[PDB]
Amino acid sequence: GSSGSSGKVKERRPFLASECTELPKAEKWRRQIIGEISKKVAQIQNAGLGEFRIRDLNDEINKLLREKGHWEVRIKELGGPDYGKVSGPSSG
């Protein structure tokens, strides 16, 4: 027989796109961020939670986007598809 089992607990995304030396890993960390941004965009579009709230949200929105610019791009620099290059002008 042989050993091979997975799916025992969720994984915590890193902080340095460089640390993740996995091409197929940066492809999943980029999509996970997109879902977060949207979920937040809604609360903001509502404009019925209160300045204090809107501020907290918008604040994260950027923090979430910045991460994407590194992932979506880090995936291309690793040898995969380009998600950041297309989005916006050329940088780097």
DSSP SS3 for 18? coil
Q: What single-letter DSSP state applies at residue 91?
A: -
Q: State the CATH number of the domain containing residue 36.
A: 1.10.287.660
Torsion sign (Cα): 15, 82, 84, 60: negative
Closest CA to 41 of 49, 83, 79: 49
Please give the helix or strand (H or E) that residue 77 lies within, else none: helix 51-78
Range of the domain at 28: 22-79
- Obtained via which technique? NMR
